[PDB]
Amino acid sequence: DTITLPCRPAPPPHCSSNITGLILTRDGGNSNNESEIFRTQLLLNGSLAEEEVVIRSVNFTDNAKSICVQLNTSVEINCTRPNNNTRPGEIIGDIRQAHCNISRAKWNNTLKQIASKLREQFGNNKTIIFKQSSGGDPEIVTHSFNCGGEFFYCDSTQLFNSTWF
């Protein structure tokens, strides 16, 4: 029903923030149609757009430059880790794993808004491809951001494994 992206650490067993935007950067190897990947990576608790996703870039022609995505609709992101600390020093109860939750259709409906806006910036003929990051730093491949004061990185992939039009 909903998606669950795997995460690595702690310490907040709450967060429950909203997605405001996302950091994108395309690479070489055009072939026939353009493919884009995320590179930081996502924005949280910022400033959302008025009506529909507002997209701009430093240099649209240049592949090496970052592309800005400012969404209109806030995408809910519920994050947790094993909480029970009452017994010292080891944790007790459910160990599960560190994870962040999003609704399957909610993200897909927000992704299609980006897709339609991505068609008009390249003169239609849409064949939008979402693939994994190139690399560089461990903070680029695993979404490094702030939530609840602290900075923590964890893998997505499950979030950008779709091809539109």
């Epitope: 080891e90 109860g93 599960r96």
Partner: antibody, heavy 135, light 106 residues
Framework: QPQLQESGPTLVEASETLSLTCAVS??????????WGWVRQPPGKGLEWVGS?????????????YHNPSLKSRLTLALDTPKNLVFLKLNSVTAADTATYYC?????????????????????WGRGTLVTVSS | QSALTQPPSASGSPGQSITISCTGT????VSWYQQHAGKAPKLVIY???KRPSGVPDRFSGSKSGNTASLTVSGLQTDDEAVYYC??????????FGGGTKLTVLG
């Protein structure tokens, strides 16, 4: 040291509600490491699991209760954390329910679990008492 | 209803070693119990291979494929009892075998 003490009516009548109470001594029912429940055995027949519980909860519940699917319909399992008592209520009894009811302390994959706790073995037992159902 | 497949009876003489089977256990949450006639059951093994407190080393756990096995080596008068096997099932349910009836000859 740890001792489980069964108590109740040794002779319940047909179609009535069978009731039994365990008196734990040497362990706390509040403790997160195990589940508490019962196991019945008919006169000269195999060991039958009855069911078990533990108040130790997660973010989505207020404890855990597990039943034997067939006995589910006619049973209630209870825990008196401070009075250190375990309870069994079995309504509408037949001569098929005549058994030596044992008070069981369940161990297994309880304390630290994934998704839910898996209790799998009766580590500490009670002396047991024979209930006789009659019409 | 659903039960673990344990042979009905078994025998050995004092000094000899008996090995009794149990089938239906796909996991490792396998346990063995000792029942003295005119008494309550005592656990003799859990987690396949592990013995509880003050339980001799002669009582042993094994599990190949779907079959669990207890081995009583060096039988004695006090070994004559009914041995049940047990395992977790499905989500959180628990099953017991039919129990093997052990007899010390002589």
């Amino acid at each position: 040291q740890p001792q489980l003490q069964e108590s109740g009516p040794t002779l319940v009548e047909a179609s009535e509600t069978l009731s039994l109470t365990c008196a734990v001594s040497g362990d706390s029912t509040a403790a997160c490491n195990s589940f508490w429940g019962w196991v019945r055995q008919p006169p000269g027949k195999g060991l039958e699991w009855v069911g078990s519980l533990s108040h130790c909860a997660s973010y989505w519940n207020r404890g855990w209760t597990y039943h034997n699917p067939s006995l589910k319909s006619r049973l209630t399992l209870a825990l008196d954390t401070p009075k250190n008592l375990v309870f069994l209520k079995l309504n509408s009894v037949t001569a098929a329910d005549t058994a030596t009811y044992y008070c069981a302390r369940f161990g297994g994959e309880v304390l630290r679990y994934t998704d839910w706790p898996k209790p799998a073995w009766v580590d500490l037992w009670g002396r047991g008492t024979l209930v006789t159902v009659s019409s | 209803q659903s039960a673990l497949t344990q042979p009905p009876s078994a025998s050995g003489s004092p000094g000899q070693s008996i090995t009794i089977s149990c089938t239906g256990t796909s996991n490792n949450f396998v346990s063995w119990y000792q029942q003295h006639a005119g008494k309550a059951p005592k656990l003799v093994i859990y987690d396949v291979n592990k013995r509880p407190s003050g339980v001799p080393d002669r009582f042993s756990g094994s599990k190949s494929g779907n079959t669990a096995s207890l081995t009583v080596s060096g039988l004695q008068t006090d070994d004559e009892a009914v041995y049940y096997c047990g395992s977790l099932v499905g989500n959180w349910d628990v099953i017991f075998g039919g129990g093997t009836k052990l007899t010390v000859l002589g």
